[PDB]
Amino acid sequence: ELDQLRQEAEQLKNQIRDARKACADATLSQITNNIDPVGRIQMRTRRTLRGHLAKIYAMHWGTDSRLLVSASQDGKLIIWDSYTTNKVHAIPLRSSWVMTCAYAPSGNYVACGGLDNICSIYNLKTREGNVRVSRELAGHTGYLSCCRFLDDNQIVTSSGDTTCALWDIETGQQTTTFTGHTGDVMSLSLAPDTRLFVSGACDASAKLWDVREGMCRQTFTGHESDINAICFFPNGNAFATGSDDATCRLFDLRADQELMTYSHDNIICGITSVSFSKSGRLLLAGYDDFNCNVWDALKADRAGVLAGHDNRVSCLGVTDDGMAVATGSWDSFLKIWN
Template identity: 55%
Template sequence: MPAPSSPTGQSAIRPAHELIAHDGYLSCCRFIDEQSLLTSSGDSTCIFWDVEKNEAITSFVDHGGDVMSLSVLPSINRHIFVSGSCDATAKVWDTRLGKCVQTHAGHESDVNAVQFFPDGNAFSTGSDDSTCRLFDIRSYGAVNVFGNDKIVSGVTSVSFSASGRLLFAGHDDSSCLAWDVLADGKGLAFQLAGHESRVSCLGVNSTGEALCTGSWDSLLKVWA
């Protein structure tokens, strides 16, 4: 029997699984492995799922506002993840313990984006307060703050270069800024300009040779 067609004439693809438990919008989802998934939501929680069983295993409920983003520790044992929330904090969680193990404060507004450093010992945050911060989970604190008085737009997304030397940040004002992680956080490494509306997402490819930015201007741009 042929696959059912959509109104456009293309074959419709049906979902293999449907996961239901959140009470708010879904802001982010990340696979841990082929059977495990993490999600974050406007209901102020994150959920750890068994995809094959269509079952919510653990709910993480310590945030006091919408959870906007999450990132999974880049290692073989992917039990640790970090989340960013509208309560202006980032929290580190352990799925084995089912609870928060670190809370990182410092931002003055919503934390919209989080991303682990390539070696897993630190993570970056991006906030509506127009700054990014680099938190070290070993020293339990911020080791750099990226921003200056000329930057007044909120940060929507963050990603590291393959080496971790550069931190890329997408902004509400259509810009993408690149920061040198080892330098003074007030000076930019460079800026990418080309979008006509807010940069809503970005990511670096696995080889580190290209950056892709997505914008409300309906365009994706690849920078090499």
């Protein structure tokens, strides 16, 4: 009976909310009240990467922490040397409508996808000199919004079809599908151990998915508008989301509750991208106000700005050692800050 089912769902939601309420001894801001503020964060463009002729939608740093890839709507995927501003490679894409970009943790491979509904894997370390497409993964019915390599042979992609898929790159078939979410999934983030990931969707819910079992362990619903960005805390026991509503929200995985909100009365635009610092003390968010903000993640007070760009900051990525922060934008320039 649909009546009994909807009543049972409401009762279970009531139980869940009561359980979360019971396990709330104190707020995070109450515990970190007696901590020393970060202080003003002043960062300067040490480099500026020019060459893209359209809006830059996605960027991904390499594990070496010197090479980075970036994707743009002129149909070009560009691998760059950060230290010397040199262009190591320039890959022509078949579909110019690309929304996501990823760099293999080994360094051999890059992945790009977009409104064509295909995730393309290209090999950089091939023996004829050219960068050629290794495999085209085509199972999703909506646009590809994010992709993140798990190994050299496993990639997890999020789609505007409400579903996340874990693929086998060699075979070419998706081994697992995560289908719980109802709205379009916009962002994906892999845990440090690569056994769990979190996805944020257009229905304002973020879900923690187990990669090996294929089910959803937890769901969080603190936001009131689309979640456009998601990122794990370095520990792996927390994560942060950024939404079209101006707020960034931090969610624990063990307490199963929202911990803080990072908002300012002046800030009313959307949050395109979010990322952490290596220690997890700074949270860097890119906004549609044309500028990026830097929040002390433990006191939730703004500590710095990155105001170089004159259009929307589309992508923000920090290095694995924390040396620098790259920010891409719709004005077609990347900037490295330190």
